Enzyme design. Structure first.
Site, PDB file in Angstrom:
ATOM      1  N   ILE A  50      42.520  43.801  27.983  1.00 57.87           N
ATOM      2  CA  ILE A  50      41.530  43.846  29.057  1.00 57.87           C
ATOM      3  C   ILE A  50      42.096  44.803  30.103  1.00 57.87           C
ATOM      4  CG2 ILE A  50      40.333  42.569  30.861  1.00 57.87           C
ATOM      5  CD1 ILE A  50      40.219  40.192  29.025  1.00 57.87           C
TER       6      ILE A  50
ATOM      7  N   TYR B 116      45.682  29.826  44.760  1.00 60.49           N
ATOM      8  CA  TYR B 116      45.889  29.306  46.110  1.00 60.49           C
ATOM      9  C   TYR B 116      46.253  27.823  46.135  1.00 60.49           C
ATOM     10  CZ  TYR B 116      45.086  28.296  51.066  1.00 60.49           C
ATOM     11  OH  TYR B 116      45.225  27.888  52.373  1.00 60.49           O
TER      12      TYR B 116
ATOM     13  N   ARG C  88      49.278  36.670  41.309  1.00 60.03           N
ATOM     14  CA  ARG C  88      48.133  36.674  42.206  1.00 60.03           C
ATOM     15  C   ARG C  88      47.505  35.311  42.422  1.00 60.03           C
ATOM     16  NH1 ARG C  88      44.306  41.871  42.588  1.00 60.03           N
ATOM     17  NH2 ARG C  88      45.974  43.230  43.364  1.00 60.03           N
TER      18      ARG C  88
ATOM     19  N   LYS D 140      44.668  35.926  28.273  1.00 56.33           N
ATOM     20  CA  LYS D 140      44.951  37.273  28.759  1.00 56.33           C
ATOM     21  C   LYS D 140      46.173  37.181  29.663  1.00 56.33           C
ATOM     22  CE  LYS D 140      43.296  40.708  32.069  1.00 56.33           C
ATOM     23  NZ  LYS D 140      42.438  40.830  33.281  1.00 56.33           N
TER      24      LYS D 140
ATOM     25  N   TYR E 149      43.055  33.259  31.504  1.00 57.69           N
ATOM     26  CA  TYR E 149      43.595  34.420  32.201  1.00 57.69           C
ATOM     27  C   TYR E 149      44.758  33.937  33.050  1.00 57.69           C
ATOM     28  CZ  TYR E 149      43.805  38.691  35.089  1.00 57.69           C
ATOM     29  OH  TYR E 149      44.209  39.837  35.739  1.00 57.69           O
TER      30      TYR E 149
ATOM     31  N   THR F 179      39.014  40.523  38.282  1.00 56.57           N
ATOM     32  CA  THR F 179      39.806  40.911  39.444  1.00 56.57           C
ATOM     33  C   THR F 179      39.563  42.370  39.816  1.00 56.57           C
ATOM     34  OG1 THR F 179      41.509  39.273  38.914  1.00 56.57           O
ATOM     35  CG2 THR F 179      42.137  41.089  40.356  1.00 56.57           C
ATOM     36  N   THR F 180      39.323  43.229  38.820  1.00 57.94           N
ATOM     37  CA  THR F 180      39.008  44.627  39.098  1.00 57.94           C
ATOM     38  C   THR F 180      37.618  44.774  39.702  1.00 57.94           C
ATOM     39  OG1 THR F 180      40.318  45.073  37.115  1.00 57.94           O
ATOM     40  CG2 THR F 180      39.201  46.926  38.133  1.00 57.94           C
TER      41      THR F 180
END
Ligand SMILES: NCCCC[C@@](N)(CC[C@](N)(CCCCN)C(=O)O)C(=O)O
Ligand SMILES: NCCCC[C@@](N)(CC[C@](N)(CCCCN)C(=O)O)C(=O)O
Lengths: 305, 296, 305, 296
Positions: free
Chosen positions: C214, C118, C149, C173, C144, C54-55
C-alpha cells in the site's frame, strides 16, 4: 554479610563535583596543565574533582595514563578541603576492581564506577559486578548510570538493593534524563545520596533530595556551579534556580556534540588550554558547532587562572 | 578488493575454572569447519571480548589461525575497540599472526561523531593490508555508523569492504546497497538473515551457528545460489531458536544452549556476565528440543 | 465462533495498492480531480486503490467528505479490474464499525482499518475492537499497524489470533520499520497476506512472502511500483530489486516531512494537481525541503494523464 | 493574561449500560469541589474523549459548568482534536456554554510539523477570548510541541498561557521556564508533580486526583506556598499509587480504582478500552490499601 546496611555509618562524597577534562599536548597528557586546571577548580569553591571520567576520555587513556591523573588529582588537593572521587569503572569486573584497589592505595577519597558498557550485563550481573567492587575496597563507592552511552541501566531495585547490601556504596550519579527515576530512588530509599550527572537539570534534581552534582559545565564555570549547589543544599531554592536558569544556554551547547567534545572546545576558546587535542575516535567539532559554542559563551563571565 | 563472505560464526569463548580452556576452543572450531562454515570470528561480543585480557585475546586469535590452517575456512579476527590506538594495535596484532581479516566494532561508550568514526576506521585501515569489515551495533555502542560514513570509508580505503549490520533496520540495508552495490553486506542479526541476504547480502556472522552450524551454513549457501525458496524455509524454521538465544543479553543464552548440548564442560561466564535465571534456563532447553544439534 | 479460521476460504486484496492523496481546491475536495487522479492509477497497472487513508488525510476529513471519496473511488473503478480497499479505521470502535458498514453497502471490495490512535488500547482491547469490526461486515478486513503514528502496536500474537478467530481478517499492512516482525508473522502464520506500508522496504518485504504493498510513492510513479510488485509476485526478484534500488531516493524524500506533506508537494511540482492545499494541522513543507523534493524528482520519468 | 492554575482533575467519565451516567458525573465533580480542587478538566484522555460522541462531549462540558457555578472551582474543558476545524468548533463550543478555558491536546495520528502546530493553535486561539492551555503528550500523539513553538505561541496569541507537559522530560521544563518565565507550566505527570512545580510550575492536571483529591490538592498548594519540604513528602508518599495507576493505559487502572472504592456503579469502558487483567486488577486494590480514600 547482611541486607541492613542503609542506616549504618556510610562515608559520602557530595557537593559540587567536576568531571575533569584531560588536556593533551603533542600526543601526551599535559600533566602540568592538568595540575593548573585543578587549582583553578579549588580556588572557586569546588568541593570535589572527578579525575578520568567520561569527560576525561577514560575510553582512550591507557592503564598507565589513567594512573598518572589519579595521582596528580590526589596530590594537588592534598592539604585542601577538596576531595578526590576517582573514576574507576569498567565493563570488565576484574578491571574495575583492579582500578578500585589502585585508587584506595594511592590516596583517593572515593571511587566513581560506571555501569559496564557494550556487553550489556543483566540485573543479576550488575549486582554481582558492584558487590565484587564494594567488597574489594574500604572507601565509598558511587554508582554511575548513563544508559545512553553504555546500553545498560541500573534498576532502581538494584541501586537500592546494593545500597542496603554494600557498606561502601552510598548513592548514584544519574545521567538518565529520567526525573521519574529520581523520584523513584529518593521516595523508596531516602538515605541515599542522589547525584546529578546532567547540568541542565542540576537544580530540579537537588530540589527533590539530591545532595550533589558531577558537572561538565563546571570545567568552564566552576564558581557558578559552586554557588548553585551550595544554595540548594542550604535550602535556598530561589537563588539556586536563578543560577540554573541562567546556565541552561551553556548547559546544552556543551552537548551539541558528544561529551567531552564541546566542553574542551569551550576551554580552548577561553584560553584555559593551549591546544584543541582529542584522542581518536574523538575529534574537534564541526565548523558550525564551533561557531555555536563561541556565540553562546559570550554571555558568561569566564574566570581565568 | 579481497572479501570474506559466506556463513560465519561468532565463536563463544569456553572457560574452565576462570581461565580460557584452549583445547575446547580448538575442538569447537573443528566442529564449525566440518559443518560447512566458511569463516570464524574469534573474540567478538559473543566471545566475551570485554572481560578477556590482552594476552588472552591474542591466544584465541592464534588458536583460530592454527585450527583453520589447511582448510577452506578463513579467520576473521575480532579487533575492535573504543580507543583507536587500541584497535590499531589489535588490527596489527591479527595481521602478523595469520588472520585473513578483522572485524572492528564501532567505538562504544564514548559516542564518536560521524567524523570521528571516519578517522577511527581510516586509522585502522592504514595499519594493515588485509580486509576490514565494519561492525555497526547501535543498541550496544550508543552510536551508529551513517550509511554515508560506511560508503565513504568503503571508497577511500582499499581494505574496508563491507559492514555487519546488527541494527534491525532493513531500510538501512537498501540504502547501503542501492548507493554502493559493490559492498559486502553481512548480517549480524540471525532472525533477519534471509531478508538481508535477500536484498543483496553476501554472508552472515551468526550466533546461532555456534549451536546449529549446518543449518546456518545451508541458509546462507542457499540464498547466494539464488534458491530463496529453500533459504527462506530454513529462516522461518530457525526463528524460534533465533529469538530464544536473546531472551537475555548475548552470549548468556547461547552459552547455556551449548552447555545443555554437552558441547562445553562448564557454564562459566566472566563478570559482569552470569548464568541466566532458571526460568530462562528452562525455556532455552525447551526450544532446543525442536532442533537437530550436530555433535562432534 | 471458533479458532480454526486460518485455512478456510478467505477473500484477499493484494497486489500493488495506492494510498490516494485527497486533492483540495478552495477549501473543498476536488471531486473531479479526484476522479482524474484515480483514472491515472488504473491506466498504469495498479491493482487496487486505498481511498481516505493516512495519505488521504483521514484525520481532517469530515464524516460526510469521507463518504464522498469512498463512493467516487468505487464508481471510477466500476467495470475495471481495480479493487477498492476503503480506509475505515478509527480510534473509537463504534466509529470504525459504522464506517465499515458504509463501505460494504456502497460497493467497497474490502476495508483498511488502522489500529486505534491516541487512546492506546491494550492487546485485549485490540482483539475486542477488531473482532467487533470483523463480525459487522462480510467483506475482507486488512489490519494497519503504524506504531509511530498511533502510539499502539498490534502484537504478532494478536494479529495471528485475529487471523484465526475472524473469517474476514486476512492480513496486515506493516508500517513498523521492523523486518523482524515480518519474519515473525510469516514464519508462524504463512497463510496470511503480509502487506508493506513502507515504500523503501517494499521488495525486502515481498521477498519474505509479502503479497502486496500500500504505497505512497505510487501517487507519483504508479507504473514503476506496479512493475516492482508484479515482478516480485512472479518470483522475479532480480528485476524487482532493480526497481526497488532505483526508487530509494524518491522513497525517502517523500518522507522528509510527515506523510502526506512531501508526496502532495511532488504532485504539485509535477502538474498532477492544480493547488498545494493541505488541511490544518497540515501545511506546505519548509522552503528547504521544497527544494529537496524537486531536486530528487528530476531523476525519474513522471507519467502524465 | 488570564490563567487557570492550581490543583486540577482530569475527570473520568462514568458509564452505565453504554450511556453517560450524567448524575454520577455531577456527583463525582461535587466530591472534587469539596476536597480543595481548583479546577476540573472534563472529557480529556482520562475522560475517554476518543470514544464519546460529539453530542456526549457537549453534555459533559455543560454538566461540569453547572456543577461548579457558585463555587471557586473553574472548568477547563477539553477541546482538542487532530483536525483544526474540529478543535476550533469545540473551542467555540466551550466558550458559548460557560467554560473558563480550554485544554487542547497536540494533534494525534497525523503528526503535524512545527509550523503545522503553530497554525493549529493560532487558529484555535483566534476562535475564542478565554485562556488556552496547550497539551503535549508525545507518547500518545506521535508528535512533540517544540519549546520554541510553545514560546512563540505564548507571545503571539493572548489566550495561550501555558502547557501541560506529559513528557517525562524535566530538561524541557527548565528550557521552557528559563526562556519564558511568565508561562504557566502545568504538570501532566503525577509522579513528577513536585519536581515540575519545584522549578516554577504553577499547577497540575492530575489523574490521581480522581481517587485522592485531598492529597493532590495539598501537594500543589504546599508547593506554591514555597513549602517544598511538605510538598515533597506528599509526592514521595504518593509515588506507589501514581505508578500503579498506569500499569495499563490510562484511564483503565484509575477507573478500576474508583470502582473498588464504590465511587462508581459499573466498571464500563467504551471499546477499544476494556477492563484490565485480574492480575493487574488485584495489584491496584493492593496499592489502594495504603491510602486514605475520601468518600462522598
Ligand atoms: N582506562 C584504562 C584502560 C581501559 C580503556 C578501555 N577501552 C578498555 C575496555 C576493554 N575492556 C579493554 C580490554 C581489551 C581486551 N579485549 C575493552 O572492552 O576493550 C575502556 O574501559 O573503555
Ligand atoms: N473521517 C471521519 C471523521 C473522523 C476524524 C477524526 N478526527 C475523529 C476522531 C475522534 N474519535 C472524533 C470523536 C470526537 C468526540 N470527542 C476524536 O478522537 O476526536 C479521526 O478519526 O482522526
Amino acid at each position: 554479610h547482611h541486607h541492613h546496611h542503609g542506616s549504618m555509618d556510610k562515608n559520602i562524597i557530595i557537593g559540587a563535583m567536576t568531571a575533569l577534562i584531560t588536556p593533551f599536548k603533542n600526543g601526551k597528557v599535559d600533566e602540568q596543565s592538568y595540575a593548573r586546571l585543578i587549582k583553578r577548580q579549588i580556588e572557586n569553591g569546588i568541593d570535589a574533582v572527578v579525575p578520568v571520567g567520561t569527560t576525561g576520555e577514560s575510553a582512550t587513556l591507557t592503564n598507565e595514563e589513567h594512573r598518572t591523573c589519579i595521582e596528580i588529582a590526589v596530590e594537588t588537593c592534598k592539604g585542601t578541603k577538596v576531595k578526590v572521587l576517582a573514576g574507576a569503572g569498567s565493563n570488565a569486573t576484574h578491571e574495575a576492581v583492579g582500578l578500585a584497589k589502585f585508587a584506595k592505595e594511592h590516596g583517593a577519597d572515593g571511587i566513581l564506577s560506571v555501569a559496564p558498557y557494550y556487553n550489556k550485563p543483566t540485573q543479576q550481573g550488575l549486582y554481582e559486578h558492584y558487590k565484587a567492587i564494594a567488597q574489594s575496597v574500604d572507601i565509598p563507592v558511587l554508582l554511575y548510570n548513563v544508559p545512553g552511552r553504555t546500553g545498560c541501566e541500573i534498576s532502581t531495585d538494584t541501586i537500592i538493593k546494593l545500597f542496603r547490601d554494600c557498606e561502601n556504596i552510598y548513592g548514584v550519579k544519574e545521567a538518565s534524563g529520567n526525573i521519574d527515576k529520581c523520584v523513584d530512588l529518593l521516595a523508596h530509599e531516602p538515605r541515599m545520596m542522589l547525584i546529578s550527572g546532567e547540568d541542565a537539570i542540576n537544580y530540579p534534581i537537588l530540589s527533590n533530595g539530591g545532595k550533589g552534582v558531577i558537572s561538565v559545565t563546571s570545567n568552564l564555570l566552576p564558581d557558578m556551579i559552586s554557588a548553585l549547589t551550595h544554595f540548594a543544599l542550604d535550602e535556598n531554592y530561589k537563588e539556586a534556580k536563578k543560577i540554573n536558569d541562567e546556565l541552561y544556554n551553556i548547559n546544552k551547547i556543551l552537548f551539541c556534540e558528544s561529551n567531552p567534545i564541546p566542553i574542551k572546545t569551550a576551554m580552548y576558546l577561553a584560553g584555559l588550554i593551549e591546544s584543541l587535542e582529542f584522542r581518536l575516535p574523538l575529534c574537534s567539532p564541526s565548523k558550525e558547532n564551533f561557531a555555536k559554542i563561541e556565540e553562546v559563551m559570550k554571555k558568561y563571565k569566564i574566570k581565568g587562572f
